[PDB]
Amino acid sequence: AETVESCLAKSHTENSFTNVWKDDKTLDRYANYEGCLWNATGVVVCTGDETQCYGTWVPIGLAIPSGADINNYAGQIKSAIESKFYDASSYAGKTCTLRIKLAPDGMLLDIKPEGGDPALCQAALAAAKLAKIPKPPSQAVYEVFKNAPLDFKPAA
Numbered sequence: 001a002e003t004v005e006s007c008l009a010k011s012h013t014e015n016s017f018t019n020v021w022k023d024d025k026t027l028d029r030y031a032n033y034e035g036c037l038w039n040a041t042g043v044v045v046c047t048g049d050e051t052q053c054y055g056t057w058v059p060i061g062l063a064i065p066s067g068a069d070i071n072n073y074a075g076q077i078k079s080a081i082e083s084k085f086y087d088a089s090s091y092a093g094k095t096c097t098l099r100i101k102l103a104p105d106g107m108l109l110d111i112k113p114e115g116g117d118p119a120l121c122q123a124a125l126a127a128a129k130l131a132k133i134p135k136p137p138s139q140a141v142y143e144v145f146k147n148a149p150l151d152f153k154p155a156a
Contacts, residue, residue: 004061007036016054016071020046027095027116027151029053032063043082044151045074047144054078055151066140073141074148076134081150085127088154096121098150100128104142106135111150124152 017031017038029040031053040055047053047070054074082088096116101109111128113121128150136142 002035002062007059007061010036010059012041012059013057014055014075015057016052016074017057018052020051020053022050027097027153029055029151030064031057033057035063037061037063040151041153041155042088043078043085044153045078045145046149046151047074048147048149050149055153056155069137069141070144073134073136073145077145077148077150080131080133081128084130085123085152085154087123088152089156091117091120091123091152091154092156094120094154096124096152098124098128098152100145100148100150102133102136102142102146102148104136104139104146106133108133114149116152120152120154124150 020031022029031038036059038057039060041058042056044053044055094117097114099114100111103109
């Protein structure tokens, strides 16, 4: 078994988890993996149903009591948008949740804030509008992300 203190020492990981749940207050997204509790940070890209999310995952203590093509394209959307958020640490401590509109093209049709800090939400919109999102690898994967939820939760 892990201790709370061994968990907090694990390395951050870039990946997606399934069985994700949200805190509709903090707007935090969490997951249990290998006996630790993880929180999704940076830019976070979820499937339309918000069960599977790709983010920069950070451990915050002990756990609380297609397939590869989906995980891969979510990673590509995250990198395309987060690489344009040049001054993320200026919003450390803030969150914004947004929703996108994607074309089969990979073109960003639209993006809209849905909640969180107003100055971070405006910076997130500007970063997303600069992004060059690759084309989806398949119509099936496009349908999965064509209306995806996106969070920004920047680090210190």
